[PDB]
Amino acid sequence: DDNHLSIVTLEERPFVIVEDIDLTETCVRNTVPCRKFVKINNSTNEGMNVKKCCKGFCIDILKKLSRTVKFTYDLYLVTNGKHGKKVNNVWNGMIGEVVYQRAVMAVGSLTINEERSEVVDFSVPFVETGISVMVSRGTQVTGLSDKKFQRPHDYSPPFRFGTVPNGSTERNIRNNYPYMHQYMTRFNQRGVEDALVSLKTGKLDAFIYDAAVLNYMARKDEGCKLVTIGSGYIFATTGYGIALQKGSPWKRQIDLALLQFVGDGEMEELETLWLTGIC
């Protein structure tokens, strides 16, 4: 029917958290049914659909939208990729499921950019993000545009800062601050966890990464020793948005519902519930 929507999502705590069905064969508590096509091994396309239970910040948004926009859904986790890249002229991830009409919309920590907006429509952003900076509490830097980053050699001792390679942040820095990117290569980290350790252990002065992620890690940092820059100094500001098919008849109602949630304070409630920590 026209009112039952296929919706794709991506496991990414705390925005989307996946659990096993409890014992019954149903999802309880604050979770919703979501299926996953689990591969047989890493060298095959064969697999099996498995019933899971999904919960989180983005799931509660989906529950709010389903109730307000008045639609039902079948939620499933993407398997080919993560959020979405254009690999060999083909979109994978959550973007691909929408572009190739396998999903009506995609819910998750999906950053709005110009590249993706050409193949999918994005809703209004429900969470602000961008390129931010995290330092040990006390260190003085503005945003990415600080001269201490653009020209690290102009200062003594020069700042030691990096990111996680092959991500959106490095791709932006490579295009906008070429020398900063060249300087960062010898300071890049395996992941977020190894970056925060480098900041605490004095091996790294600044970590440059997604704004929403850095803010979430800062609010639950043990000892509250890591802090992010103010929102006014975030570079290339954007947001997490819900992707839809181009010309979708649902985008108008989704936008009004999302803007209502921001105005209602329901969005703040979800941020306090899922994203705010103890710092």
Partner 1 sequence: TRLKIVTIHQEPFVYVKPTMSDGTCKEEFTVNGDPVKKVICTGPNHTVPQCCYGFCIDLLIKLARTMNFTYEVHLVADGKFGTQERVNNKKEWNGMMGELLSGQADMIVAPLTINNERAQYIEFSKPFKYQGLTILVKKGTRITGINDPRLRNPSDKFIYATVKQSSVDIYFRRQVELSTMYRHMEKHNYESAAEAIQAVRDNKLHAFIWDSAVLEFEASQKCDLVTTGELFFRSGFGIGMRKDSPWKQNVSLSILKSHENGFMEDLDKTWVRYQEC
Ligand X SMILES: O=C(O)CCc1ccc2c(ccc3cc(C(=O)N4CCN[C@@H](C(=O)O)[C@H]4C(=O)O)ccc32)c1
**Pattern 95-114, partner 1, x by CB under 8 A:** -----------------xxx
Classified as helix, coil or strand, 35 is strand
Which residues does residue 93 pair with via DSSP β-bridges, in sequence order? none
CA pair distance 11, 37, nearest whole angstrom = 13
63 or 86: CB nearest ligand X: 86
Residue 198 marked in a binding site: no
Residue 109 marked in a binding site: yes
- The least distance separating ligand X from the CB of residue 240, rounded to whole angstroms, comes to 7
Classified as helix, coil or strand, 247 is coil
Site membership for partner 1, residue 265 (CB under 8 A): yes
Angle at 172 between CA 255 and CA 153, to 5 degrees: 140
CA distances in angstroms from 240 to 1, 43, 105, 243, 259, listed in the order given = 29, 33, 13, 9, 14
43 or 166: CB nearest ligand X: 166
Site for ligand X in 5-34 (CB under 6 A): 12-13
CA pair distance 109, 116, nearest whole angstrom = 14
Site for ligand X in 182-211 (CB under 6 A): 192, 210
CA distances in angstroms from 49 to 45, 95, 98, 151, listed in the order given = 13, 21, 19, 52
Q: Are 206 and 98 in contact (CB under 8 A)?
A: no
- The least distance separating ligand X from the CB of residue 192, rounded to whole angstroms, comes to 4
Site membership for ligand X, residue 215 (CB under 6 A): no
Of 125, 151, 192, 266, the residue at the interface with partner 1 (CB under 8 A) is 125
Annotated binding site for L-glutamate: 109, 111, 116, 168-169, 210
* Residues annotated in a binding site: 109, 111, 116, 168-169, 210
**Where do contacts with partner 1 occur on this chain (CB under 8 A)?**
112-114, 117-118, 122, 124-125, 128, 130, 145, 172, 175-176, 231-232, 234-239, 255-256, 259-260, 262-265
